[PDB]
Design a protein around this ligand. Structure first.
Ligand code: HEM
Ligand SMILES: C=C1/C(=C\C=C2/CCC[C@]3(C)[C@@H]([C@H](C)/C=C/[C@H](C)C(C)(C)O)CC[C@@H]23)C[C@@H](O)C[C@@H]1O
Length: 404
């Protein structure tokens, strides 16, 4: 059997967090090793590169030789579940220029600074809505199911024109898809959403409707500028991204802030600090840290290392956000620091489309919690919480809380 030292120069990747707001030990090890790249071993034994420094992450995310095509044979699959995406049609997150741009520009109008400003009343109403329900009822509560998830779900459903009456079905399907550990579970959840979305489209062709899905049906689809299957994939991307990301940030931010009480107190005492604290929480929690998979379509030299055509690269933004050449004392939460230039939303042509909606939601959420529930606290110890694995969007599925 295996009788000799087990040390490797290609550690298994991804790794799981042990603390909700710290790098897994393996990732801290990658962060420490000099050089922009490091070999890793994926779940199926294939080797890939991870990018572990901040400037090299921007350079590689900006390089069009690193393709986002998830259907490529050599795309770095991080779990068996990925096989679902490899064989399903692709929203623009998986396209490269010029096709990427033609699809992304069909959606941008809903996410402009002006549209996001105009959404503030609505976001505050939904947030205070779910709080007055949770507070009317009294502690204890699961903050995830009573607040963290339904808030961004309601907001994104409205933007998309997806009926909130249907929330139990699609929230369930979103979770199963994103947290799937096998191909078959992922495929089923994807087929569930696809069928639901496909029915919604035919409805709008009969009776034009509000929201982005309504607009896409009435314009681009009727002009044959998007295929019906691409519309489904696009809507599914926005639906899932709109649900799962903000919800994960909300629960992890509560946990993290309650663990740094001096900074949470500073935050409450000066609300002009909230936008900066949001950026710092984004930098520090990096909830989509493996949403940086790429395949090289040509050889790329990186500071004397060679990524060859055909090789998988993952730009790991959690690690990149802990680069001490950019953020002094990178592992310290500091809501006053400049968290400018962080990579929690990526960089370049695929930088998060929803990033300013997420910023608005989190600002409104933190202000509301501080205003309405200043006594909020965890109902259980941090160590008792169950953290999702490193193969999915970071966070917790349950968060017990109590208050006055
Ligand atoms: C709240 C925290 C969020 C985080 C940390 C986050 C993170 C990211 C990252 C790292 C990427 C880049 C993926 C890549 O380069 O392959 C991305 C892309 C994307 N995000 Fe977000 N995101 C968040 C919120 C949202 C929200 C609320 C939406 C609403 C729909 C959204 C929609 C998208 C879309 C459509 C893309 C693909 C953009 C493109 O391919 O051009 N995101 N996000
Ligand atoms: C939500 C979509 C779909 C699937 C999404 C999935 C299934 C597998 C695992 C996914 C890709 C999650 C994980 C976190 C992403 C991993 C990335 C990639 C890599 C680079 C492999 O680590 C997020 C969303 C999940 C179906 C597709 O047709 C449309 C849309 O992209």
């Amino acid at each position: 059997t295996a009788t000799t030292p087990q040390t490797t120069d290609a550690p298994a990747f991804p790794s799981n967090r042990s603390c909700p707001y710290q790098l897994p030990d393996g990732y801290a090890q990658l962060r420490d090793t000099p050089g922009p790249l490091h070999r890793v071993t994926l779940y199926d034994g294939r080797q890939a590169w991870v990018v572990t420094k901040h400037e090299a992450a921007r350079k590689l995310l900006g390089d069009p030789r690193l393709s986002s095509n998830r259907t490529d044979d050599n795309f770095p699959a991080t779990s068996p579940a990925f096989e679902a995406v490899r064989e399903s049609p692709q929203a623009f997150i998986g396209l490269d220029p010029p096709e990427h741009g033609t699809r992304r520009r069909m959606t941008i109008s809903e996410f402009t600074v002006k549209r996001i400003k105009g959404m503030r009343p609505e976001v505050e109403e939904v947030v205070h809505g779910f709080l007055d329900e949770m507070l009317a009822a009294g502690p204890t509560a699961d903050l995830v199911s009573q607040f963290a998830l339904p808030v961004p779900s309601m907001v994104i459903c409205r933007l998309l024109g997806v009926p909130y009456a249907d929330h139990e079905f699609f929230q369930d399907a979103s979770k199963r898809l994103v947290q799937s550990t096998d191909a078959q579970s992922a495929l089923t959840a994807r087929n569930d959403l696809a069928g639901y979305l496909d029915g919604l489209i035919t409805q709008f062709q009969t009776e034009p409707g509000a929201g982005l899905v309504g607009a896409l049906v009435a314009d681009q689809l009727a002009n044959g500028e998007i295929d019906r299957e691409e519309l489904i994939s696009t809507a599914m991307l926005l639906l899932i991204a709109g649900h799962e990301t903000t919800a994960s940030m909300t629960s992890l931010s509560v946990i993290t802030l309650l663990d740094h009480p001096e900074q949470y107190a500073a935050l409450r005492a000066d609300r002009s600090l909230v936008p900066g604290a949001v950026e710092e929480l984004l930098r520090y929690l990096a909830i989509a840290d493996i949403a940086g998979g790429r395949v090289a379509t040509a050889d790329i030299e990186v500071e004397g290392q060679l990524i060859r055509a055909g090789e998988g690269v993952i730009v790991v933004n959690s690690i990149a956000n802990r680069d001490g050449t950019v953020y002094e004392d990178p592992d310290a939460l500091d809501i006053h620091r400049s968290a400018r230039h962080h990579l929690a939303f990526g960089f370049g042509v695929h930088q998060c489309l929803g990033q300013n909606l997420a910023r608005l939601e989190l600002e409104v959420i933190l202000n509301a919690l501080m205003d309405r529930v200043p006594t909020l606290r965890l109902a259980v110890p941090v160590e008792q919480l169950v953290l999702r694995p490193g193969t999915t969007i970071q966070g917790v599925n349950e968060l017990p809380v109590t208050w006055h």
